[PDB]
Amino acid sequence: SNVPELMLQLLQLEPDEDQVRARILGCLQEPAAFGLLCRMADQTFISIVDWARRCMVFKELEVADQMTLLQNCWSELLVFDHIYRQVQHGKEGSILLVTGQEVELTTVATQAGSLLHSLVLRAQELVLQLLALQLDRQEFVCLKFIILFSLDLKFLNNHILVKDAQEKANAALLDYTLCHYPHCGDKFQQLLLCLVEVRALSMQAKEYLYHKHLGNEMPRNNLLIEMLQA
Amino acid sequence: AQALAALLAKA
């Protein structure tokens, strides 16, 4: 059936998962597990950026605006990435990591601390929710874009260019949504809700890292910590 | 930023 342009293009702008696992997995080789995961996160964050750099209207923007956009949505993109991977993982007993690993919820239930434990379960509630709505790649992809440009226009230099990117994305989703998912429920508005949820997790996730930081647990050259401070 | 300014489009 008829798919919006923005969704088609954006779908070509997506990298190979195996390539990601390849890229992320190889970059690792150079407590113990903790440090690895921090590095794995940082790496998925960089990969999340090359996605941005190679992005459409985002690249045509000034560097001053690119910085600020990412500085505002880096956390949501990450969490959302972790989230969608579970939409494809399907399971409810364990979480799937960008590497390829599997971690049972029983394992984090006993090992993780109050906060992470908490956050991880909250993230999974959002995974069931998005599964019910039947989230697909076309929307998934469209949604990431939307998260990238979800900022107040009073914070950018290139005013108009962004306002066009935002309205473009929302109308694209509404189209694809009312069109292909003609079942009952307003998926366009419903999905938008899942996104404000993501934004809530993002903040909690930032509070965790910050906790780790204060406690001097995070790696030294950690990228995430570099974003947390701004 | 560093990892963003220097790392974004510098390479």
- State whether residue B11 sits within 8 Å of chain A by CB: no
State how far the alpha carbon of A53 is from the alpha carbons of A17, A88, A130, in Å. 18, 25, 27
Closest chain B CA to residue A49: B8
Domain that holds residue A94: 1-230
Cβ atoms of A192 and A134 within 8 Å: the answer is no
User: Inter-chain contact B1–A71, Cβ cutoff 8 Å?
Assistant: yes
Show residues of chain A in contact with B8, CB under 8 Å: 49, 53, 63, 66-67
User: Inter-chain contact A67–B5, Cβ cutoff 8 Å?
Assistant: yes
State how far the alpha carbon of A56 is from the alpha carbons of A2, A14, A76, A171, B11, in Å. 21, 12, 19, 17, 19
User: Inter-chain contact B1–A53, Cβ cutoff 8 Å?
Assistant: no
Cβ atoms of A144 and A182 within 8 Å: the answer is no
Closest chain B CA to residue A221: B3
Task: State the CB neighbour count (10 A cutoff) for residue A57.
Answer: 18
Show residues of chain B in contact with A66, CB under 8 Å: 4, 8-9
CATH number at residue A15: 1.10.565.10
* A127 token code pair: 């995974």
Number of residues in chain A: 230
Cβ atoms of A91 and A100 within 8 Å: the answer is no
Q: Is A208 annotated as a binding residue?
A: yes
Q: Is A113 annotated as a binding residue?
A: yes
User: Inter-chain contact B5–A53, Cβ cutoff 8 Å?
Assistant: no
Report the alpha-carbon distance of residue A88 to residue A83 in Å, rounded: 9
- Method by which the model was determined: X-ray
Strands A102-104 and A94-96, bridge-based pairing: antiparallel
Quote the number of domains for chain A: 1
Phi, psi of A112, deg, nearest 5: -60, 160
Report the alpha-carbon distance of residue A134 to residue A177 in Å, rounded: 11
8-state DSSP, A15? P
